Scaffold this active site. Structure first.
Site, PDB file in Angstrom:
ATOM      1  N   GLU A  23       0.831  -1.193   0.000  1.00 14.33           N
ATOM      2  CA  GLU A  23       0.000   0.000   0.000  1.00 14.33           C
ATOM      3  C   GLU A  23       0.864   1.240   0.000  1.00 14.33           C
ATOM      4  OE1 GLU A  23      -3.731  -0.046   1.883  1.00 14.33           O
ATOM      5  OE2 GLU A  23      -3.156  -1.808   3.118  1.00 14.33           O
ATOM      6  N   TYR A  26      -2.307   6.551  -0.628  1.00 13.22           N
ATOM      7  CA  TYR A  26      -3.632   6.674  -1.247  1.00 13.22           C
ATOM      8  C   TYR A  26      -3.867   5.575  -2.287  1.00 13.22           C
ATOM      9  CZ  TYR A  26      -0.447   9.631  -4.019  1.00 13.22           C
ATOM     10  OH  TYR A  26       0.665  10.163  -4.635  1.00 13.22           O
ATOM     11  N   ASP A 139      13.487  12.315  -5.600  1.00 11.19           N
ATOM     12  CA  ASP A 139      13.126  11.460  -4.456  1.00 11.19           C
ATOM     13  C   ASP A 139      13.750  10.064  -4.568  1.00 11.19           C
ATOM     14  OD1 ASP A 139      11.953  10.816  -1.933  1.00 11.19           O
ATOM     15  OD2 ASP A 139       9.974  10.622  -2.781  1.00 11.19           O
TER      16      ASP A 139
END
Ligand SMILES: Nc1ncnc2c1ncn2[C@@H]1O[C@H](COP(=O)(O)OP(N)(=O)O)[C@@H](O)[C@H]1O
Ligand SMILES: *[C@@H]1[C@@H](C(=O)OC(C)(C)C)C(=O)CC[C@]1(Cc1ccccc1)C(=O)OC
Length: 340
Positions: A23, A26, A139
């Site tokens: 997961e 969202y 990132d």
């Protein structure tokens, strides 16, 4: 409509036999079987339309991955959403199925020097491609370097990517370049090299090298190893308020890389040093990294493709209302809908 752990996964009939993988903040990721192409896939269920920054990240990742085609960058095979924009509450991004990621792998295995060298080359081969498209990933960290059963490494998660121009909540900031802790603007391709060096260092020790609790604590980790910045390094700091604060710190000695990682290949520590330079201008660029002696055996410019053309977002996403961004997402995904 198949369900997984109580979540609706409305991907049938083309995709079936769904297994939970994990997961995000969202969404939920499953593996699935593509019955048309007879291949195993990953499917990311995204539900971003109630939050404007989730809508930014979703639009960014769809736009950049659809445009990228490289062996070390995750692609998008297909996207499923509803046939009308009122009905679309979920986007399903279908990707190539990956086994694990480098975060998980480093939890359980210590990499030998051969494997560290193999992984670093793939990271840099893909980064060379990203940067040649004038994109910053912004990132890079172990958790979004995916590996497949073939032990092929693929950079993923471009939701924070930006087109480079030298003239947002993140999970972990441990791979962030010092200049991001110091300035609020002026981010160049250099910030990705720093992160790659942070990942190299972690592969060498199975622990992160700069694991601070906040921006001040993160910087003290950096300076506690790099040593105090040089006079010339302080001048390259843009934000005077930040530059002033570094002057007030007590002097710290530079810990030689040989002492942090007593057992690393000397050729690797040399390259780490040129990636973990404080001054963004003196930091090594991705081609020079690839040409570094640590990657002699893998270096091959003729098999290190680059982007066709520089990226241009054609629009800035920062100020758009989330209803506008849902409209842009709907447009971006129309090409996967039958009859476009
Ligand atoms: N294409 C993919 N293949 C296999 N697994 C994948 C994948 N894309 C994401 N995953 C997995 O799903 C979880 C990541 O969810 P995601 O939202 O995309 O990334 P994250 N960890 O930054 O929050 C991780 O366990 C990751 O390994
Ligand atoms: C691949 C890599 C690995 O976990 O692969 C998966 C498929 C994700 C489990 C390693 O850690 C080490 C390198 C790796 C496996 C390997 C191959 C040959 C000798 C030792 C290890 C690899 O390079 O295979 C292509």
């Amino acid at each position: 409509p198949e369900m997984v752990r109580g979540q609706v996964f409305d991907v049938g009939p083309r995709y079936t036999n769904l297994s939970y993988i994990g997961e995000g903040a969202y969404g939920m990721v499953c593996s699935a079987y593509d019955n048309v192409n007879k291949v195993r896939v990953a499917i990311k269920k995204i539900s971003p339309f109630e939050h404007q920054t989730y809508c930014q990240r979703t639009l960014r990742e769809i736009k950049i991955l659809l445009r990228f085609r490289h062996e070390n960058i995750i692609g998008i095979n297909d996207i499923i959403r509803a046939p009308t924009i009122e009905q679309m509450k979920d986007v399903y991004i279908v990707q190539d199925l990956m086994e694990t990621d480098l975060y998980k792998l480093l939890k359980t295995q210590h990499l030998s020097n051969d494997h560290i060298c193999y992984f670093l080359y793939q990271i840099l081969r893909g980064l060379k491609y990203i940067h040649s498209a004038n994109v910053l990933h912004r990132d890079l960290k172990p958790s979004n370097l995916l590996l497949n059963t073939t032990c092929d490494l693929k950079i993923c998660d471009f939701g924070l990517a930006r087109v480079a121009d030298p003239d947002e909540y993140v999970a972990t900031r441990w791979y962030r370049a010092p200049e991001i802790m110091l300035n609020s603007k002026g981010y160049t391709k250099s910030i990705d090299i720093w992160s790659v060096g942070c990942i190299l260092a972690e592969m060498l020790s199975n622990r992160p090298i700069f694991p601070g609790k906040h921006y001040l604590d993160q910087l003290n980790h950096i300076l506690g190893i790099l040593g105090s910045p040089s006079q010339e390094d302080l001048n390259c700091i843009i934000n005077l308020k930040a530059r002033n604060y570094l002057l007030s710190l007590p002097h710290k000695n530079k810990v030689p890389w040989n002492r942090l990682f007593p057992n690393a290949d000397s050729k690797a520590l040399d390259l780490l040093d040129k990636m973990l330079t404080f001054n963004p201008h003196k930091r090594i660029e991705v081609e020079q990294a690839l040409a570094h002696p640590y990657l002699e055996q893998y270096y091959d410019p003729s098999d290190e493709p680059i982007a066709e053309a520089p990226f241009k977002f054609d629009m800035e996403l920062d100020d758009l209302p989330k209803e506008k961004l849902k409209e842009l997402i709907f447009e971006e995904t129309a090409r996967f809908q039958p009859g476009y």
